[PDB]
Design a protein around this ligand. Structure first.
Ligand code: BLS
Ligand code: MG
Ligand code: MG
Ligand code: MG
Ligand code: MG
Ligand code: MG
Ligand code: MG
Ligand code: MG
Ligand code: MG
Ligand code: MG
Ligand code: MG
Ligand code: MG
Ligand code: MG
Ligand code: MG
Ligand code: MG
Ligand code: MG
Ligand code: MG
Ligand code: MG
Ligand code: MG
Ligand code: MG
Ligand code: MG
Ligand code: MG
Ligand code: MG
Lengths: 159, 293
RNA sequence: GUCUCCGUAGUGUAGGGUAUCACGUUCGCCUAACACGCGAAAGGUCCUCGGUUCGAAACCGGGCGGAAACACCA
RNA sequence: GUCUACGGCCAUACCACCCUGAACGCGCCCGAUCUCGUCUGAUCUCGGAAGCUAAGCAGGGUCGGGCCUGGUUAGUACUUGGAUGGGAGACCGCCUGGGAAUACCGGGUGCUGUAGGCUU
RNA sequence: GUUUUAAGCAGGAGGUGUCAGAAAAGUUACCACAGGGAUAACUGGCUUGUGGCGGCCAAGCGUUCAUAGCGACGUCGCUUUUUGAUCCUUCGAUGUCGGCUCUUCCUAUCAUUGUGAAGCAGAAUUCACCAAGCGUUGGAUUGUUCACCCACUAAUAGGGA
RNA sequence: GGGCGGUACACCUGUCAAACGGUAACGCAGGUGUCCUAAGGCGAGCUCAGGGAGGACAGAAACCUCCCGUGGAGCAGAAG
RNA sequence: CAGUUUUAUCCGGUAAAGCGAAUGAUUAGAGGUCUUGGGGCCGAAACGAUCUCAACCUAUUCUCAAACUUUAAAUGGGUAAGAAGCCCGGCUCGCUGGUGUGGAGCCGGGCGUGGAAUGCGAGUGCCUAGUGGGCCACUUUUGGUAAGCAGAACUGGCGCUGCGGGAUGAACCGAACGCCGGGUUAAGGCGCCCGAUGCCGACGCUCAUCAGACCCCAGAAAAGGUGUUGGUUGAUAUAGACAGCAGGAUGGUGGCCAUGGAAGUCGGAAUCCGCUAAGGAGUGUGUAACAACUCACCUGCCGAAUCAACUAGCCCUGAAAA
RNA sequence: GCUCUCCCACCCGGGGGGCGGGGCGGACUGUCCCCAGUGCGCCCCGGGCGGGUCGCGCCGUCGGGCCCGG
């Protein structure tokens, strides 16, 4: 019968990385966070005010609220079978952006660039991502010499 | 015979501090309060007002902050005074108030709020917290950022404060550390401050140094007397700072004659020369070794 | 069945900066000699090794020895 | 090339010993009437400017430590799945696919996304 | 209808430690009912630390000489005649300690039969092999299994069902 | 098995936990039923343990002074 | 929409590893000045000199870690994969503001190649029975000497369920059921019981006075063997070698000092080279001693071997019940 | 485009070297330097490597174009 504390089993988790102790650098704060952006959550042991509970360290959600020093956020969780949609209020230190949406926002623009162009040309340019196909037949030139014969080594006791 | 404490196992477990703290010019615990904007403001910048004291110079700059390093809008040096006619005692309290005025109406002459929002023309010494004007574009504010100078009671920084305020900037302050504050009964005079502004405490040396002795009047007044400045010329300039020479606030940065682009710093000794030095030293040590003995 | 003390001159035995009594026993003191009584001897791995210590036998265990204990309810 | 305020994890930027430093600059330096403070005008605060290159300064140096990246160690150690595969058991081989880390040997030693004054 | 009191609504406090919160000391060998093999006391099962038995290695003892007989510090196994551990089956009942009487069985052999080695001259004695057909007693004290002692003898070996 | 003996009967800290989270036994090593007008709330100013070299009585260890000094000290209690 | 995969992205401190890196544990030497002592030691003193044992500093070395860590895998955990998006005008605001700044909310218009792979009809809303005594295996794992013992995590089964195989069997291996004809297979098996080799089956090891014979499984070892079959490393091969029907071993001396008597036949530092195919002051018998003998090492006659070591495979001893 | 080795020369065919050789500026360190080693900038020449692309002719298909076309 283990305990039900706030910070059970977080010896290594809220700890600072090696040789990165000390002062929180000042480009963590003055970044801007709108509503609708997608955010991952990483804990931190310096500023004890406004920590998340230990079961959110790694999850990723979106914003619904902005406060004076915090943003509200909507995440998902799995409790004994079902999935709950719960919302918290997290200070800024414990929070980063997620770059997962960005290669999509670079491919919406690239596709609409590849569509506005060459539609008036009557061209049919491929739009779907297609998985890595099986590779093509190709020649191999051995100019001159022969392949190098291998030999399995005879055993000797190394130790 | 004691243990060397700067071992390999001292340099492995040694996280360095920040560069501006190693070069000790700054404070990050005093910045973090001053510089951040509240997140419900959404890219509304937070103006701060830098004041720097150097042993021969005064600097007064204005800057907000970004992620690319905090960015200047309007600078005001204290050696652009001898344009106007103050050549000596370049760093006293008087030029600390004259620079903050040159900054103030420089910025108002870069935004277009000159005739509106004058500020104080006379020099009195009392509180002139400038209130905003209805209908017109609102006032301008900027918070102070002194830094590493103990703001006790009587600092030259506050003279630049009173100058930019009376120029028209709206800076929050309270008259508790100004020259003229009674630390036993808590009242405040104006004329003691105006006796400290125009240069009368600087002047009184035209007695305590002009009578009691005459040898030290030339040991430490050797540039007033060279520029022919008497101790009664403590005089107004501010109509010259006011009128029209902020149409060159920047002095019109001067053009640049083409430089020869010559170098004054010996370049880095390369690899294929550091691999060659120790072959010289090993052959010289063996030809000065086997010959001798 | 195994847990609780404690081991120290020859005898037995008092107690973080020295190894102490009482008796055992050699020489010397009063006396008329005698007894009683008195004063100076020898005597020490304070159980055998390692650490705390500036200095530990008295602090710490691991260990070997002895004695005094305990095992209940078909 | 320098001064002011910075950015990024803040070391490619640190530490130790050497050396050259033009002009503008930064600084040690000259001092104690001015309600700035101390047991102490050294530190802090102010008023200054005769005089000069040690300075967290600036730049280069060390068959340097340190750090930052690359090979070796190694398809080794480990490992998701499977077998009426061995073996008395301990544990080890195979198919299937994933796959590290030191020692050791090499190269690098501040970019400045930065705004204002400035080797100009 | 008026004044006293009480009842009202809101916020703190007066505590329940078996801590989501009853107000509570014993025994029955005179004993009774409802049930349980979910849960003990016997046997039997799987296990073998403890008990019992047997190996390897070879520093020494053995007047001398490692191994005729013995074996230190170390190490590999079997046996269920000791005690423990566990709780699978039976509590709408499997009659629970010893002894008397009575058949059979195993061998890890005390004696007898046939044979080897000795620090075996003979006489005595210790050591091992094939081997369980045949034997292994009479008595005092104790409820005794166990013990202890007096005699005889070829020998007074050890156990299970 | 019951009993005598204990609290795993409400809480927290490391471990078992098999690299998110969750997770048992009479499994381990440990603690609590409090304390404080400051040991709470702001601001200025300083930097610790240990170590060296010295200095009258001063010794292993009193105080002073200089240098090195990434936490080796401290933060009321258990441990991170 | 998914108990799944790909392409982008962040998260984690386990197995491994590492002390020449911190926190703790630990072995042995090497250079130094003493950094200090207990004793030698010369000393009226010393870090003078000291043997040092010893701790002290520096470079090195042997092993370790659930409540220690620089690094750091495998599986694994969330998000995103376009119309609920993009892009253009404009409006309101009493919050925010130097500047219609900064945001948010609103009226409008324009843009579909449906923007990874594979498979499938989905969505919500009521009332409610039975149950809350659980068990086994593969791996992973804590206490315990161990248990067909006790206690947890991932998936799967018996319970709820039969069928062919394992002689027999609640869980193992195949496989999941309407009543029936024909065919073929799975795990398994084919001398007879008992359906199937009544093959001209193929290549080899093995003899037991206790042979031996198929997952869970009903039993057994360390050590041994000139029993045999393979193998491995160097040292003797037409270098008559590797066994023996074989021709013989001491004129100095009869060693030195030696035993009473010993010449090798007894004791001792020793142990040689001198016609020497041959030294040994004898491997040895003998004799009171020698005398007389043979031999270590060497000299004659014929047509292919030795020393250890893997227990390397099977076989045996090791190996005692009612 | 970058520039290692067959080999090239200083030196004893090889190591060392290689991208070499020529002219000019400035910098460089141990040695007395000569040295030679390097080395940046500027210019010229030689040398092979490496494919892209533009192109060529020739060989190579019981080839391809309703099995081109007369
Ligand atoms: C209590 N008694 C004993 C008689 C009882 N009525 C019946 C009886 O036999 N009781 C006893 C039987 C079993 C019980 N017992 C004993 C040992 C044990 N390990 N577990 C038990 O439960 O102990 C009881 C005990 O005597 O006290 C008397 N008044 N004498
Ligand atoms: Mg620069
Ligand atoms: Mg010039
Ligand atoms: Mg280095
Ligand atoms: Mg009675
Ligand atoms: Mg009775
Ligand atoms: Mg039972
Ligand atoms: Mg039994
Ligand atoms: Mg035993
Ligand atoms: Mg003997
Ligand atoms: Mg019955
Ligand atoms: Mg009956
Ligand atoms: Mg027998
Ligand atoms: Mg997990
Ligand atoms: Mg406190
Ligand atoms: Mg470990
Ligand atoms: Mg059970
Ligand atoms: Mg179980
Ligand atoms: Mg089934
Ligand atoms: Mg079912
Ligand atoms: Mg069977
Ligand atoms: Mg299977
Ligand atoms: Mg059959």
């Amino acid at each position: 019968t283990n305990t039900k504390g706030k910070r059970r089993g977080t010896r290594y988790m809220f700890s600072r990385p090696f040789r990165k102790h000390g002062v929180v650098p000042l480009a963590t704060y003055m970044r801007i966070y709108k509503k609708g952006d997608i955010v991952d959550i990483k804990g931190m042991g310096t500023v004890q005010k406004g920590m998340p509970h230990k079961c959110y360290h790694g999850k990723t959600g979106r914003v619904y609220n902005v406060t004076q020093h915090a943003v509200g956020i909507v995440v998902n969780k799995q409790v004994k079978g079902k999935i709950l949609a719960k919302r918290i209020n997290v200070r800024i230190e414990h929070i980063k952006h997620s770059k997962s949406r960005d290669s999509f926002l670079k491919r919406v623009k690239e596709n609409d660039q590849k569509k506005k162009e060459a539609k008036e040309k009557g061209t049919w340019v491929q739009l779907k991502r297609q998985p890595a196909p099986p590779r093509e037949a190709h020649f191999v030139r051995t100019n001159g010499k022969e392949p190098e014969l291998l030999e399995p080594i005879p055993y000797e006791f190394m130790a | 015979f004691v243990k060397v404490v700067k071992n390999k196992a001292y340099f492995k477990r040694y996280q360095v501090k920040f560069r501006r703290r190693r070069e000790g010019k700054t404070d990050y615990y005093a910045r973090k309060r001053l510089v951040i904007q509240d997140k419900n403001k959404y890219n509304t910048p937070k103006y701060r007002m830098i004041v720097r004291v150097t042993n021969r110079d005064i600097i007064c700059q204005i800057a907000y902050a970004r992620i690319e390093g905090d960015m200047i809008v309007c600078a005001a040096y204290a050696h652009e005074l001898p344009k106007y006619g103050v050549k000596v005692g370049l760093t006293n309290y008087a030029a600390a108030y004259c620079t903050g005025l040159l900054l103030a109406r420089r910025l108002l002459n870069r935004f277009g709020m000159d005739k509106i929002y004058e500020g104080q023309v006379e020099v009195t010494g009392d509180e002139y917290n400038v209130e905003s004007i209805d209908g017109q574009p609102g006032a301008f504010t900027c918070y102070l950022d002194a830094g590493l100078a103990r703001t006790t009671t009587g600092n030259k920084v506050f003279g630049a404060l009173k100058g930019a305020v009376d120029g028209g900037l709206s800076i929050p302050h309270s008259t508790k550390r100004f020259p003229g504050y009674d630390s036993e009964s808590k009242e405040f005079n104006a004329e003691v401050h105006r006796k400290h502004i125009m240069g009368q405490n600087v002047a009184d040396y035209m007695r305590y140094l002009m009578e009691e002795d005459e040898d030290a009047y030339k040991k430490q007044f050797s540039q007033y007397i060279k520029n022919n400045v008497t101790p009664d010329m403590m005089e107004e300039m501010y109509k010259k700072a006011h009128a029209a020479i902020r149409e060159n606030p920047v002095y019109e940065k001067k053009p640049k004659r083409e430089v020869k682009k010559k170098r004054w710093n010996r370049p880095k000794m390369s690899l294929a020369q550091k691999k060659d030095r120790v072959a010289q030293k090993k052959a010289s040590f063996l030809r000065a070794q086997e010959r001798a003995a």
